[PDB]
Scaffold this active site. Structure first.
Site, PDB file in Angstrom:
ATOM      1  N   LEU A 204       0.830  -1.139   0.027  1.00 23.31           N
ATOM      2  CA  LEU A 204      -0.008  -0.212  -0.013  1.00 23.31           C
ATOM      3  C   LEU A 204       0.838   1.188  -0.026  1.00 23.31           C
ATOM      4  O   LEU A 204       2.125   1.090   0.467  1.00 23.31           O
ATOM      5  CB  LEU A 204      -0.847  -0.031   1.075  1.00 23.31           C
ATOM      6  CG  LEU A 204      -2.134  -1.158   1.396  1.00 23.31           C
ATOM      7  CD1 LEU A 204      -2.668  -0.959   2.458  1.00 23.31           C
ATOM      8  CD2 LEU A 204      -2.941  -0.966   0.017  1.00 23.31           C
ATOM      9  N   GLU A 288       1.312  -8.166  11.794  1.00 24.75           N
ATOM     10  CA  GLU A 288       2.323  -8.816  12.687  1.00 24.75           C
ATOM     11  C   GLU A 288       1.760  -8.488  13.923  1.00 24.75           C
ATOM     12  O   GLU A 288       0.881  -7.686  14.370  1.00 24.75           O
ATOM     13  CB  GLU A 288       3.678  -8.041  12.443  1.00 24.75           C
ATOM     14  CG  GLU A 288       4.955  -8.658  13.478  1.00 24.75           C
ATOM     15  CD  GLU A 288       6.104  -7.984  13.231  1.00 24.75           C
ATOM     16  OE1 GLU A 288       6.046  -6.916  12.637  1.00 24.75           O
ATOM     17  OE2 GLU A 288       6.882  -8.197  13.853  1.00 24.75           O
ATOM     18  N   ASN A 290       3.373  -8.436  18.102  1.00 20.88           N
ATOM     19  CA  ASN A 290       4.606  -8.299  19.090  1.00 20.88           C
ATOM     20  C   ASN A 290       3.999  -8.927  20.207  1.00 20.88           C
ATOM     21  O   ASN A 290       3.491  -8.366  21.097  1.00 20.88           O
ATOM     22  CB  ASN A 290       5.004  -7.040  19.111  1.00 20.88           C
ATOM     23  CG  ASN A 290       5.762  -6.343  18.017  1.00 20.88           C
ATOM     24  OD1 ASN A 290       5.333  -5.454  17.494  1.00 20.88           O
ATOM     25  ND2 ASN A 290       6.765  -7.248  17.557  1.00 20.88           N
ATOM     26  N   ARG A 292       5.239  -9.081  23.254  1.00 21.54           N
ATOM     27  CA  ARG A 292       6.175  -8.802  24.316  1.00 21.54           C
ATOM     28  C   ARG A 292       5.434  -7.239  24.798  1.00 21.54           C
ATOM     29  O   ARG A 292       4.496  -6.971  24.263  1.00 21.54           O
ATOM     30  CB  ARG A 292       7.841  -8.409  23.738  1.00 21.54           C
ATOM     31  CG  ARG A 292       7.602  -7.914  22.423  1.00 21.54           C
ATOM     32  CD  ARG A 292       9.045  -7.259  22.227  1.00 21.54           C
ATOM     33  NE  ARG A 292       9.026  -6.966  20.687  1.00 21.54           N
ATOM     34  CZ  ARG A 292       8.456  -5.795  20.453  1.00 21.54           C
ATOM     35  NH1 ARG A 292       8.043  -4.889  21.008  1.00 21.54           N
ATOM     36  NH2 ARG A 292       8.708  -5.338  18.883  1.00 21.54           N
TER      37      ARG A 292
HETATM   38  N1  LIG Z   1       2.130  -4.652   3.890  1.00 17.63           N
HETATM   39  C1  LIG Z   1       2.568  -3.324   4.272  1.00 17.63           C
HETATM   40  N2  LIG Z   1       2.369  -2.104   3.439  1.00 17.63           N
HETATM   41  C2  LIG Z   1       2.757  -0.974   3.963  1.00 17.63           C
HETATM   42  N3  LIG Z   1       3.724  -0.808   4.749  1.00 17.63           N
HETATM   43  C3  LIG Z   1       4.141  -1.862   5.503  1.00 17.63           C
HETATM   44  C4  LIG Z   1       3.610  -3.276   5.340  1.00 17.63           C
HETATM   45  N4  LIG Z   1       4.170  -4.006   6.242  1.00 17.63           N
HETATM   46  C5  LIG Z   1       5.140  -3.231   6.901  1.00 17.63           C
HETATM   47  N5  LIG Z   1       4.949  -2.059   6.617  1.00 17.63           N
HETATM   48  C6  LIG Z   1       5.612  -0.814   7.225  1.00 17.63           C
HETATM   49  O1  LIG Z   1       6.872  -1.461   8.084  1.00 17.63           O
HETATM   50  C7  LIG Z   1       6.612  -1.036   9.629  1.00 17.63           C
HETATM   51  C8  LIG Z   1       7.093  -2.505  10.286  1.00 17.63           C
HETATM   52  O2  LIG Z   1       6.369  -3.590   9.758  1.00 17.63           O
HETATM   53  P1  LIG Z   1       6.451  -4.990  10.796  1.00 17.63           P
HETATM   54  O3  LIG Z   1       6.092  -5.904   9.896  1.00 17.63           O
HETATM   55  O4  LIG Z   1       5.877  -4.576  11.951  1.00 17.63           O
HETATM   56  O5  LIG Z   1       8.370  -4.868  10.658  1.00 17.63           O
HETATM   57  P2  LIG Z   1       8.982  -5.251  11.961  1.00 17.63           P
HETATM   58  O6  LIG Z   1       9.106  -6.723  12.158  1.00 17.63           O
HETATM   59  O7  LIG Z   1      10.521  -4.815  11.332  1.00 17.63           O
HETATM   60  O8  LIG Z   1       8.590  -4.100  12.974  1.00 17.63           O
HETATM   61  C9  LIG Z   1       4.983  -0.983   9.763  1.00 17.63           C
HETATM   62  O9  LIG Z   1       4.706  -0.195  10.583  1.00 17.63           O
HETATM   63  C10 LIG Z   1       4.953  -0.324   8.417  1.00 17.63           C
HETATM   64  O10 LIG Z   1       4.927   1.032   8.330  1.00 17.63           O
HETATM   65 MG   LIG Z   2       6.545  -4.181  13.719  1.00 16.52          MG
END
Ligand SMILES: Nc1ncnc2c1ncn2[C@@H]1O[C@H](COP(=O)(O)OP(=O)(O)O)[C@@H](O)[C@H]1O
Ligand SMILES: [Mg+2]
Ligand SMILES: CC(=O)SCCNC(=O)CCNC(=O)[C@H](O)C(C)(C)COP(=O)(O)OP(=O)(O)OC[C@H]1O[C@@H](n2cnc3c(N)ncnc32)[C@H](O)[C@@H]1OP(=O)(O)O
Ligand SMILES: *C(=O)CCCC[C@@H]1SC[C@@H]2NC(=O)N[C@@H]21
Ligand SMILES: [Zn+2]
Lengths: 449, 77, 284, 316, 57
Positions: A204, A288, A290, A292
């Site tokens: 997105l 995702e 978390n 924790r």
């Molecule tokens: N499918 C996605 N589309 C747009 N942005 C994303 C998407 N997945 C992750 N992000 C961006 O990356 C950030 C961290 O993603 P996340 O999966 O939580 O990775 P991490 O494990 O490194 O925290 C999200 O808050 C978002 O801003």
């Molecule tokens: Mg994250």
């Protein structure tokens, strides 16, 4: 109640856990490295144990050393906090079998939820909406990958399912580099998280980072606190949070909280966790979880009055949830601005010695850090050197209090990101509330002639 | 001189068995390759080895007292 | 002023009870490990990747598919006939090893199946008096060879022996020739045989069928030769070359085909056998 | 790292590669990269076509030993799959100048034996610049016997400057090992196909090159002696090596018209180093086509046909 | 001429499985291709004293 636990972490979160333990009357065990022998929480603890030399691999990632320290001191539980061994499922399994109590989810749920593809599959199984995508790691067929990408709609992103920490993910713009990008992302995932599994998901362009903190005792009880919003991200890592988020009316809040509670009930979750999402025109997309205590936990305590670490220590002690769904009240607003010892612009860490330190103080200001006069910042771990909150009655009041505190706040001797925080506060769109995740990057701009 | 330090954290002992003789003695000199004490961890008694030869100047530890990393145990001149 | 605080000693005595069977040690590296984790990692120390001892039946279970293990020649047992008079009676060591390892002899035979392809397997239990080759060992190997010949399938043996069984005297030495004859019989037929050299492979077995198969696959940091390093030390009264008789060294000196780590071993063996037998590759 | 006569192409490629970096280099430059890159590539292609329209036996030798060219490992990776490397001669050592192993091709397992040179200087030193010691030839004999045993096809590559003229090679029966190889390979029951990728020859390379089929690349040489050695012997001077190369006919068309090989495998324009993937595709297609028809023959008839083709050798 | 090495090798292989011996004797000198075709391939390798034998000069 846990008679005596172990602070399996370092720094700010270690100090916060120490304060909470001394509040609840639980004794303290301090485990530290040889470089961090003058930490605030280490000095403010009864029992201090050194379990390795300066490097993280030999000292804090040394699970045998932590278990040895927990055996010699007689503890009956261990608190990991965030980072390091927060999500190490094998660590949870070993601690469970070593004869102690792991303050957090059961290792089975850690395995099921930490791996992103399994977490998304489980969320879809529980009815929680998820981003349409591959729903499985893809192979070496470029035709299949581009067919799936066209099915979900370009652009697309490859993220390491065992990945995290703002790395191990690459965005794909077109098929001209899809295979190479996937292969190099798999290589990075191998080099970082010891897993080659990489998957494809819809990408997105205008998201709003919305996440909901939840609690459950694993005994059929699941309560959800207020929301959060971390729209100001840098390199996919948060710099300015806020809770609750603008535009999220209580109808949607209850609607998504009930679903998250049902998900926690179905998974049989325990401990403190948060269900991340992606928000756009009323649609939420889980990406995702978390499992924790999240770093930006204070912006939920101050708007609800419920101490998260106290909740975790009570749940790990086996006590049922003392707070019901109707007994959670959302009253206020909050802002948080992390402080890091990095370079303001180049983002290079700047360790050294601190010369002058001075907390903000005031009504609604809550300064979470361990730095002090003469404290030498070690060049060995994360660059965070403190959190900072300013709880107000509305968003504008919170922003004003944060501006005042940042004016008051003084850290000298090393480079700090306070200037970027001031610039973010001064921005009109930021003060309005509701900016996109990339807003920070748009304000970043690019090269010049 | 040189002081031996335990590289691990755990229970400290001097006799490898509940009823036995200590590995070394104060006074009489010791060599580079020798075991001097036991630092038990998780019920796995490991041995502590010096690195320099010399006379045992003094012993700075007592049996049954846990020690940690970088803890001077016995000084060798 | 907590800023200037000294470090007091931890509590002199507190009653802590960790379960006894959840921690081991690796003398190669020193990193304490979780026993169940190590057992789930095919007896490989995950930190320094230094292989350790493994039960012969455990090795067979790891290689052969579950639901197909078929032991062959299990009726044979040590039937001592020499009545050797050592410092201890040979019956003493025989009984001690038999009651400790829970197995009749060093070699363990199990006809199994690998990825849909029938295969015979075998392995030496090193704890059985240094895994010495008895008459039962050779007879069981011949039984496996006969099963392979009558039921066409590759044969695999994993070598682990400190040498020939002295207390059986020349009789164990003739087992070398017997196994060599079996290998010659099955080699002109065209059925392969891949002997893998574990840690350690010395003495008679090293020179009978360990170093005679179509492939010589060694496992890292294994001691392979004919005479123990102490014997060579007393013979040449000098210093051995660095890394003497190590799989890395012995593949440099051309006596070793390839070095394969245990986690990859199952897939590698399946692929090699499928190619050599010209069968379709296994699906992974 | 280019040759002497490749200067017009070399200069332009120092500017084409930068334009990709210049797209986001600095100062907010994102110039109209696409059209300029396409024009520069057109110019480079035309210059390369004009340069390689004129070709010489020395130029043929230089391209055969251009210090950027697909070796046996490159062709195995980019034309075969599931390659399992087998090492060891069983006798003394595993000489790096020969790389052998067993791999699958279109579901049919094959035995691949060929020399390997190395890209970096360290790798070239480690592999002795593709000069096989006798133990390597013994290893090749063992691998060929193993392939013969399990009814397996054999396809081998020939890319080596020459059999190593070292002290150890002569001490350890160099000629004896090569003769032993050349005797057994005339008794194999499976087809043997060989390619002259890179530069190969000097007679020693024939220990893995006596089979039903022989093929050569477009820019490869296969001579009894090295052109420099031939010059230094016959012409009493090393600098007359191009004259010796012209006289001998080490170039691909000369060795093709002499009815010593089957066909010349074409290269991508610019030689093999410009587009190694297209070269690998051509080589894969050629080897598959060659292997297709040969497998019809039965082992006894195959050996008889090989023996008759063995008699066909020589002018008399 | 190089192919003649393979031709002679084929002849030697043909007659060696039949059982008829072949004794190649190495005079002074034996080098080059012949040294590695049938000079060093017979059932016996009989050399004459002080002869230069190898593959490369
Ligand atoms: N499918 C996605 N589309 C747009 N942005 C994303 C998407 N997945 C992750 N992000 C961006 O990356 C950030 C961290 O993603 P996340 O999966 O939580 O990775 P991490 O494990 O490194 O925290 C999200 O808050 C978002 O801003
Ligand atoms: Mg994250
Ligand atoms: C001539 C022959 O074929 S037998 C001669 C003995 N073997 C050799 O000379 C070759 C190697 N020599 C050795 O000593 C070892 O095999 C080495 C070098 C691999 C060392 O491995 P180690 O870890 O030292 O194993 P070790 O020799 O202790 O073997 C374990 C046990 O097997 C016994 N053992 C090993 N090989 C034999 C054998 N051939 N006959 C009888 N007992 C044997 C040992 O006596 C020992 O018993 P113990 O522990 O109860 O005293
Ligand atoms: C475990 O249950 C307790 C035994 C630990 C070691 C014993 S207790 C004290 C004895 N003396 C010594 O040095 N170690 C022996
Ligand atoms: Zn280890």
């Amino acid at each position: 109640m846990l008679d005596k636990i172990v602070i399996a972490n370092r720094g700010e979160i270690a100090l916060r856990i120490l304060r909470a333990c001394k509040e609840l009357g639980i004794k303290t065990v301090a485990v530290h490295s040889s470089a961090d022998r003058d930490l605030k929480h280490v000095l403010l603890a009864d029992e201090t144990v050194c379990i390795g030399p300066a490097p993280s691999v030999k000292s804090y990632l040394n699970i045998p050393a932590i278990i040895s320290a927990a055996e010699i001191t007689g503890a009956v539980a261990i608190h990991p906090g965030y980072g390091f061994l927060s999500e190490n499922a094998n660590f949870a399994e070993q601690v469970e079998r070593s004869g102690f109590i792991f303050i957090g989810p059961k290792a089975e749920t850690i395995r099921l939820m930490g791996d992103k593809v399994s977490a998304i599959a489980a969320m879809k199984k529980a009815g929680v909406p998820c981003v349409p995508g591959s729903d499985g790691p893809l192979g070496d067929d470029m035709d299949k990958n581009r067919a799936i990408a066209k099915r979900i709609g370009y652009p697309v992103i490859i993220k390491a399912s065992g990945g995290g920490g703002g790395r191990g993910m690459r965005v794909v713009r077109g098929d001209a580099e899809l295979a190479q990008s996937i292969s190099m992302t798999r290589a990075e995932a191998k080099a970082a998280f010891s897993n080659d599994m990489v998957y494809m998901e819809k990408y997105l362009e205008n998201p709003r980072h919305v996440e909901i903190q939840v609690l459950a005792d694993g005994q059929g009880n699941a309560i959800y606190l207020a929301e959060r919003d971390c729209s100001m991200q840098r390199r996919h890592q948060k710099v300015v949070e806020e809770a609750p988020a603008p535009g999220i009316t209580p109808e949607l809040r209850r609607y998504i909280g009930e679903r998250c509670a049902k998900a926690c009930v179905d998974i049989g979750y325990r401990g403190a966790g948060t269900f991340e999402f992606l928000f756009e025109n009323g649609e939420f997309y889980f990406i995702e979880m978390n499992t924790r205590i999240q770093v930006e936990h204070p912006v939920t305590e101050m708007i609800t009055g419920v101490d998260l670490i106290k909740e975790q220590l009570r749940i790990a002690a086996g006590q049922p949830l003392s707070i019901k769904q109707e007994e959670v009240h959302v009253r206020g607003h909050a802002v948080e601005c992390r402080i890091n010892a990095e370079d303001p612009n180049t983002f290079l860490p700047s360790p050294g010695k601190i010369t002058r330190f001075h907390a903000p103080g005031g009504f609604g200001v809550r300064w979470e850090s361990h730095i002090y006069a003469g404290y030498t910042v070690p060049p060995y771990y994360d660059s965070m050197i403190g959190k900072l909150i300013c709880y107000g009655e509305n968003r504008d009041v919170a922003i004003a209090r944060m501006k005042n505190a940042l004016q008051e706040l003084i850290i000298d001797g090393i480079k700090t990101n306070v200037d970027l925080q001031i610039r973010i506060m001064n921005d009109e769109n930021f003060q309005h509330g509701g900016t996109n995740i990339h807003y920070l990057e748009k304000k970043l701009g690019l090269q010049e002639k | 001189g040189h002081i031996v330090r335990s590289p691990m954290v755990g229970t400290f002992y001097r006799t490898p068995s509940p009823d036995a003789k200590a590995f070394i003695e104060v006074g009489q000199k010791v060599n580079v390759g020798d075991t001097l004490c036991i630092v038990e961890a998780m019920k796995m008694m490991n041995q502590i080895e010096a690195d320099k030869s010399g006379t045992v100047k003094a012993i700075l530890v007592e049996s049954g007292q846990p020690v940690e990393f970088d803890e001077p145990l016995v000084v060798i001149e | 002023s907590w800023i200037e605080r000294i470090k007091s000693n931890i509590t002199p005595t507190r009653k802590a009870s960790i379960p006894e069977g959840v921690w081991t040690k690796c003398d190669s590296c020193g990193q304490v490990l979780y026993r169940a984790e190590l057992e789930r990692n095919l007896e490989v120390c995950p930190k320094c990747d230094h292989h350790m001892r493994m039960t012969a039946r455990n090795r067979l279970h790891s290689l052969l598919d579950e639901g197909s293990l078929v032991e062959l020649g299990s009726e044979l047992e040590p039937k001592d006939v020499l009545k050797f008079r050592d410092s201890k009676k040979y019956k003493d060591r025989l009984a001690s090893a038999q009651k400790e390892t829970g197995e009749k002899d060093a070699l363990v035979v199990m006809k199994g199946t690998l990825y849909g392809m029938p295969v015979v397997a075998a392995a030496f239990e090193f704890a059985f008096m240094g895994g010495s080759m008895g008459s039962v060992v050779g007879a069981r190997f011949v039984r496996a060879v006969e099963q392979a010949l009558e039921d066409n399938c590759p044969l695999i043996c994993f070598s682990a022996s400190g040498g020939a069984r002295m207390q059986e005297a020349l009789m164990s030495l003739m087992q070398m020739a017997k196994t060599s004859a079996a290998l010659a019989k099955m080699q002109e037929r065209g059925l392969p045989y891949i002997s893998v050299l574990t840690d350690p492979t010395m003495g008679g077995v090293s020179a009978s069928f360990a170093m005679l198969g179509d492939l010589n696959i060694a496992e890292p940091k294994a001691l392979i030769g004919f005479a123990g390093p102490r014997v060579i030390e007393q013979t040449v009264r000098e210093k051995l070359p660095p890394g003497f008789q190590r799989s890395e060294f012995l593949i440099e000196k051309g006596a070793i085909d390839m070095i394969v780590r245990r986690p990859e071993m199952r897939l590698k063996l399946a692929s090699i056998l499928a190619k050599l037998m010209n069968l379709p590759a296994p699906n992974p | 790292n280019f040759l002497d006569f490749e200067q017009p192409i070399a200069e332009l490629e120092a500017k084409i590669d930068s334009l990709t970096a210049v797209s986001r280099q600095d100062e907010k430059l994102d110039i109209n990269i696409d059209e300029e890159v396409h024009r520069l590539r057109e110019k480079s292609v035309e210059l390369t076509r004009k340069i390689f329209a004129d070709l010489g036996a020395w130029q043929i030798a230089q391209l055969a030993r251009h210090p950027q060219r697909p070796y046996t490992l490159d062709y195995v990776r980019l034309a075969f799959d599931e390659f399992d490397e087998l090492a060891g001669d069983r006798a003394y050592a595993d000489d790096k100048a020969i790389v052998g192993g067993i791999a699958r091709l279109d579901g049919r397992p094959v035995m691949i034996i060929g020399h390997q040179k190395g890209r970096e200087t360290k790798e070239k030193i480690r592999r002795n610049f593709g000069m096989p010691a006798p133990e390597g030839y013994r290893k090749a004999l063992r691998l060929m016997q193993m392939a013969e045993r399990f009814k397996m096809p054999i396809i081998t590559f020939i890319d080596t400057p020459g059999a190593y003229p070292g002290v150890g090679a002569e001490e350890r029966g160099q000629s004896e090992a090569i003769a032993r190889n050349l005797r057994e390979m005339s008794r194999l029951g499976v087809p043997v196909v060989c390619t002259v990728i890179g530069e190969g020859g000097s007679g020693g390379a024939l220990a893995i090159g006596v089979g039903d089929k022989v093929n050569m690349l477009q820019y490869s040489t296969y001579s009894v002696i090295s052109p420099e050695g031939c010059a230094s012997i016959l012409w009493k001077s090393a600098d007359k090596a191009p004259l010796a190369a012209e006289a001998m006919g080490i170039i691909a068309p000369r060795l093709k018209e002499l009815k010593l090989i089957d066909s010349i495998i074409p290269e991508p324009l610019g030689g093999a180093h410009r587009n190694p993937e297209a070269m690998a595709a051509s080589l894969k297609a050629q080897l598959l086509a060659d292997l297709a028809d040969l497998d019809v023959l039965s082992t006894e008839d195959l050996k008889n046909r090989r023996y008759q083709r063995l008699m066909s050798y020589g002018y008399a």
